[PDB]
Write a protein that binds this ligand. Structure first.
Ligand code: HDD
Ligand code: HDD
Lengths: 727, 309, 727, 83, 84
């Protein structure tokens, strides 16, 4: 019609902008100059809109898209209205089956590059030269919940990376913890059914806090290691940018000489490790169920590209049996104190998709998609995964041509004798559709294995044994890994683990299941078992009190790489601060605050009791981003209150509760000038307390002290003080 | 191995119990004596479990459901393991496309009966006799969110009833407000796309609080009436038991003489009308996203059967 | 490798060659410089093969495409063999549901061009200028059989044309007869189920000759007009190039002033009308079930492009009720004597597809696909069709994005707010997916109807009446059109119709059905009724002999344009002759023979009792195309036997049968020199017979005679004589 | 999965076993059977682990594969004995 | 006609239900990033009821224009000023 506003404010600038500054938009319109080989190859299917006539799918221009064709303007709709029927038919069949697991996920485009050639240990082309750039598409996810469930639940997270290499797609399909819950893929449907919503009523969504999960866990002790990780703060990451990624399974690297090296894949977050606290995560599932999806997308639009370092744990073939645990058991981690992670390369996620459905929802990742230079192992969970991810896309993506959906297509050549199938896009001109043929001189042809550009050949591992449905005896140990994890955590991390188990078991209706899990915990660590038992009103028996603790893992009594926080790895860039405004802010405080945050890449959101604008003491007009209730403290990392007319918000329930909530959740709070009158809201001593920044003005060291607190993420020393507090 | 506790406390007593007194269970096990013609007719496909062997779908008993078939106990999985492949194949194809709209919903079985014969205004068989009962199956829902989204969002709610009558199925597919947002069905995809999560990033879930919805409303003043109802406390009902239901459209009733009467359908909640307050409703989407689903299920297990006039 | 023969004889020349001179090939390899806008736009999805490596669909090169991965070379296949699983998975899902009706069909690409601008009667862009070339894709088909059924069955044929216009796809979905069997689309499932294989045992394939079909016809007299056409030789076309096409329904042309003109669409074969005879057609279903598909493909490879003239019957809106039939009744034809066909343009089919499945099997045509300048009418059969052809593709082609399958894509712009759906190819960048919107300034936008490039607006026909499920009383006449058709046929065409009814009804097991059908024939024409009755051993009653014949159609007692052969229109270019060789052929006969055929564009196939070659009297080495049994007379239009050593084949039973079969099927036979010894096997008098060319040698007079016979297609005067030929 | 529309093709009448079939598989397109088991996983205590595994035996026993000896490298190779 | 039914609904609500309607609109429009959309919706509320339009505008920091303050309320629905 010409409905947009004449000032052109309906459209976001095509330049990096902080979260909340402009309306978000499709990647290619937001960052048109951000390109890569894969992004460029999708140009054949990108569709624009501006200046085009509205049509049917058959290209017929529509004159009136506001009405159905009827006999009389109040008459019946006619069957001949093909414009209406096409438009409703397409709407009526928009949905496709969601992923069986990991249905909730958020994705982005980026690129990877190795630091140096790894040709001595692998012939994989994407790892052969530091100047070879490989486009990637990454999808992060939860596990149990549907595609419409919430982001900040307590659960493992998926981390899947599609590498578009010159010798084929390589999908590295991992999670955010270094082990899985079960050992053999045959039990995957039992474990998943137990964690998913129960079958009679389909409750609960996005939560393992229910009877069937804890029933299965209590009967299958192999699950305890990953359950410990889920009950820790690892289960509630602050962002997909601040969590680790792992392939879990031991795979193989194969070099040109045919030597095999065992390898476990790692991703290290260059923004550091950081998690929420349970009350915050749970409440944030209501206040903003799309918090992680939102934070990922906004980070990329702001230029805070998610960056990860790919690393390898490498173990020589001859050391297969040198550890206390089996290398092929996916419920066991390889302690970094035993086998260090070797830095391999960096991945940078720097562009959002254009259309979520087309690129995110239809993407298909599968761990069987490997390339020459990589190979599998006999890990029994990985072995069964190889069957499932090709199988499942026959219903999810409608057929066997899912590699032809734009986001999934290889950027390297693909040619073979496969034909037809639903939705076939490629029109083959080969005279032959079989080999061997003479009618096309046998093309396309097989290629012998070789150092570069050769055909895939499996490593000739020796296989010896009878055909058995049997778990290796070497996998029958379930408590030392859980115990190593427990002992590696800080005291506040241990408390959060105890609280996670306590909260989840309190939602288990059948008391005997609680009792049975507590008995399993007594096989891991007595302190942990006693603390959870106490919270459940359960007393350990004398037998439980004397269960001997599992042995150390290869002599280790702890490994600090297992803790999120034991070793500081703080990074403030991309964090966000709530600034609580008043109707006459001291502009000098705000100038100091905003400029210090901007110099460190820390975002801010100006909050007030209404929307619109407020005018500072010097006449500066301040645009309000959101109200106190509209953008709760759950969404920020720290809270700053500048001086001015504090009487304006001193008695505002929301403004006070904002600080109580952030204080409860261990976030740094800074109060300037008269804003120190809020100290009584959070009961802060006159002398002050570690974790609260306070001064006569926001000058001098006020912002540096606040930023130091943000670098340590949360104020763990405040835990004992929050215990009480009615918030 | 892994067996029921000695005391029998793993299984819910089959009698009406208050919320939280017993673990919830499938209806036919919770209330085996509760019947109606539709519930009885579903007996051909109900499948039990106690005392039966674990099998493949082809009926072959399974000896070891804990392991894949491999060459050696630390060896590769064999392709001949058909037990594993059937089991994982069925898991791999569990999901079906969710509803385009109203994908999140909660349902129950029940029955309907007219107060008196309505034969003077309609020849419909299910409304012809006060002592002639008609089985029903009712689904309550939200509109925008996926099947895994939260219950206590701010939104219109669906209220659909399937009447299994002697002369055919009658579905009364209504909502909890007496009007809809738009006038012509040709605009349905435009309105639904405007309220659904935005196409670039698929945010936000279960919320009309976002630019495209208010853009559409601002350009299409026909939407204001139902938007008023959604912004009121009608948009955040306390329970599915405590909201009204309406067919919205004028339909016709046709009697045996051929006379047509225009009719609009209503459901009155005999538990009364009651809604949450916003702060409560929004926080409850995070503390218990399945609150309405749970509340309906438990009211029926407790004997507080949802009743509507 | 190198399996191709060193001489390069595995690959067909990329130049026009006669049927059987080279192996057939994908269209783009056979005729790479035959281009059109649609063919060029498919280049993005065409995939080659030569010189490429064999890969998985994920782009991974394969080393050994001959073996599965196993533990030991006689061991069990491993689940980790992803190369095997991908290849078998694709194979396992190659098939898609066939079309409900018209599953058997053969297709080609071409182009259309108008003879003059039709802007005075229609604003349809493709008809606006003689220099506007519109790419087309045409699929010809039978109706009842599966996709694997035979071509030369007795049945109506489908003739579907997809026009890729600059203002949208226009599909003209018609048949080879001018009416349909039923009046309202609500009965289509009943008619179709009655003609299809019966439900208990799924017999018979590709045949109406069974009880349920004749049961339905006997109880629904509206079907009799199309049944008459099916029982005539119209039901057994010689080739898709030699049949007419009709849209059947009255549609509307709309001009720039908004005036509506009723129109019926026609396709006139520029190669002339020609049909087989029943025994030849039925036997040809067994000797070559692919005969019509082959004939179409090979005509195009030879440069005998199928050409049709588009024709319109135009009736002013004010003449709606001036006929004695209803213009909206699809069981009624508009006699060309009353309303002439205006010649409007030409369509030429000049290129075969590259991949049958991708382009033919997946093509989707629908009569509802119209463009501005065209509109529907209330014909109750066309009205219901409008719902079906969009609905059926949701299962057949897997979803609502079937317009994105390459062959179905418009070549003109298409932009709208529809999104998602299974296998979504297009990646939309529009910030908005709804209208009205302000965030993209309401694009893509609606367009007002107009003279050119305007949006679609339906013609504002007045609708008055009650909502009823009622047949118009004006459609209640069922015998006058059938009679008009009958009286328009030649005496031998009449005899063939009698023979068609008689043969089909003999296969009806319930005698009462045969009698009820004969009763219907008595309401059409007594002579027809009596002759069919006599072949069934049925006696017309007193009452049936006195049924008054239906009235003439608007004064007509016949219309020669309804006959296949009444008005000469034959064309020999593209026809084929079988030449029966001996071991010492009179080379002078062959030269005269082949020089004369080549001047008329008539092909030849050289046959012998074995493959390889024979050597003529002068030493010319003649290559053999097929044996006498290998390429039966059914597959050729005429038979020529040159002199030489007749003794060699004079006692060859296959050689004698070849002539007896061709004789019986009314084909021209030419005998030179001692080839005249074969007159005894087909019992031809010493003085000769019209239809048999004989002479001392094969000079130019002999060939002109033979080519004259071939232009008249068949020797109809020989019918009375074939009775006594045991063949 | 494509020919018969999904993983519940054993529920199409002609394919149905005449002997008992019980397991923990659920859902899928056109699911006919309505499972009443409180549990859809094993091991479970909430339904006392039913339906239960059965050891192999002379009659009515669970399926156990014959324990054939496997020995060799992981190869894509045709046995020479087949040539 | 788009405003009389909205108005009938508004006037039939109790004072605390009216406040909750105001709060619902205020909360939802505060999450609309583009300010002109908020303004356009406030303009539509001014065609329904000025008390409602002003209470929402106040929470959005918007000031109604003089023209908006003079929009005539829609007619009653068949004489009804409210329906409990
Ligand atoms: C045998 C079945 C099986 C097993 C044992 C696993 N999963 Fe899996 N997973 C699948 C069956 C599967 C799946 C049904 O095939 C899925 C869902 C839909 C899809 O495309 O893949 C899937 C999705 C899937 C995703 C989502 C990819 C995306 O974003 O689309 C990730 C991140 C994981 N899984 C990761 C893992 C890890 C790290 C595993 C253990 C080490 C694990 N899975 C075990
Ligand atoms: C109400 C349904 C109905 C009606 C009354 C008819 N058809 Fe039809 N026909 C269809 C329902 C259909 C179909 C179910 O929708 C099909 C099969 C699959 C599809 O794509 O289209 C089809 C295909 C189809 C084809 C094959 C298109 C191709 O090559 O793919 C042609 C030539 C015809 N039809 C022509 C006719 C004619 C000239 C009709 C009467 C005048 C007739 N149809 C009436």
């Amino acid at each position: 019609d010409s409905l947009a506003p004449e000032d052109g404010s309906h459209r976001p600038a095509a330049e990096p902008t902080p979260p909340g500054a402009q309306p978000t938009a499709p990647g290619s319109l937001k960052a048109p100059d951000t390109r890569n080989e894969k992004l460029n190859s999708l140009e054949d299917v990108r569709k624009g809109s501006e200046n085009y006539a509205l049509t049917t799918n058959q290209g017929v221009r529509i004159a009136d898209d506001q009405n159905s064709l009827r006999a009389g303007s109040r008459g019946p709709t006619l069957l001949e209205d093909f414009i209406l029927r096409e438009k409703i038919t397409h709407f009526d069949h928009e949905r496709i089956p969601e992923r069986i697991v990991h249905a909730r996920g958020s994705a982005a485009h980026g690129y990877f590059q190795p630091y140096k050639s790894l040709s001595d240990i692998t012939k994989a082309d994407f790892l052969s030269d530091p100047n070879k750039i490989t486009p990637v598409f990454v999808r992060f996810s939860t596990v149990q919940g549907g595609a419409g469930s919430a982001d900040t639940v307590r659960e493992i997270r998926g981390f899947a990376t599609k590498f578009y290499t010159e010798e084929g797609i390589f999908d590295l399909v991992g999670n955010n913890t270094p082990i899985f819950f079960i050992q053999d893929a045959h039990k995957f449907p039992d474990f998943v059914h137990a964690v998913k919503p129960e079958p009679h009523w389909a409750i609960p969504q996005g939560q393992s806090a229910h009877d069937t999960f804890w029933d299965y866990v209590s009967l299958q002790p192999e699950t305890l290691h990953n359950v410990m990780w889920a009950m820790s703060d690892r289960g509630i990451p602050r962002s997909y940018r601040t969590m680790e990624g792992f392939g879990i399974h031991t795979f193989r690297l194969i070099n040109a000489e045919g030597k095999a090296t065992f390898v476990r894949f790692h991703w290290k977050p260059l923004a550091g490790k950081a998690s929420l606290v349970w009350d915050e995560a749970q409440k944030l599932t209501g206040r903003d169920p799309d918090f992680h999806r939102r934070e990922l997308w906004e980070a990329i639009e702001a230029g805070d590209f998610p960056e990860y370092e790919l690393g390898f744990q490498l173990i020589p073939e001859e050391d297969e049996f040198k550890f206390d645990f089996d290398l092929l058991d996916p419920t066991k981690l390889i302690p970094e104190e035993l086998v260090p992670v070797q830095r391999v390369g960096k991945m940078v996620l720097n562009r959002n998709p254009d259309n979520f459905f087309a690129e995110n929802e239809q993407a298909a990742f599968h761990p069987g998609h490997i390339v020459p230079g990589l190979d599998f192992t006999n890990d029994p969970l990985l072995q069964g995964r190889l069957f499932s991810y090709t199988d499942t896309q026959i219903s999810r993506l409608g057929g066997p041509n899912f590699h032809e959906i734009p986001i999934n297509r290889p950027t390297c050549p693909y040619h073979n004798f496969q034909r037809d199938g639903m939705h076939r896009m490629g029109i083959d001109t080969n005279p032959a559709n079989y080999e061997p043929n003479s009618i096309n001189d046998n093309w396309p042809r097989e290629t012998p294995p070789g150092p570069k550009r050769g055909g895939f050949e499996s490593y000739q591992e020796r296989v010896e044994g009878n055909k058995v449905r049997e778990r290796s005896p070497s996998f029958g140990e379930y408590y030392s890994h859980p115990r190593l994890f427990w002992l590696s955590q800080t005291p506040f991390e241990q408390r959060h683990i105890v609280d996670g188990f306590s909260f989840e078991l309190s939602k288990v209706v059948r008391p005997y299941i609680r009792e049975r899990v507590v008995d399993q915990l007594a096989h891991i660590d007595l302190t942990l078992a006693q603390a959870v038992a106490k919270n459940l009103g359960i007393e350990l028996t004398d037998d439980q009190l004397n269960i001997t603790p599992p042995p150390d893992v290869n002599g280790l009594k702890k490994d600090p790489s297992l803790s999120l926080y034991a070793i500081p790895d703080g990074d403030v860039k991309g964090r966000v601060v709530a600034i609580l405004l008043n109707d006459e802010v001291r502009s000098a405080d705000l100038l100091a605050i905003l400029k210090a945050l901007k110099a460190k890449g820390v975002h801010a959101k100006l909050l007030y009791s209404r929307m619109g604008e407020v005018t500072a003491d010097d006449g500066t007009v301040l645009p309000i981003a959101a109200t106190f209730a509209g953008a709760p403290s759950l969404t920020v990392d720290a809270v700053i209150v500048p001086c001015g007319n504090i009487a304006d918000i001193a008695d505002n329930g929301d403004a006070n509760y904002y600080l109580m909530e952030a204080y409860k959740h261990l976030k740094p709070i800074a109060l300037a000038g008269d804003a120190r009158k809020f100290k009584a809201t959070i009961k802060i001593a006159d002398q002050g307390e570690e974790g609260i920044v306070e001064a006569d003005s926001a000058d001098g060291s006020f912002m540096d002290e606040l930023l130091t607190l943000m670098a340590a993420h949360r104020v763990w020393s405040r835990i004992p003080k929050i215990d009480k507090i009615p918030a």
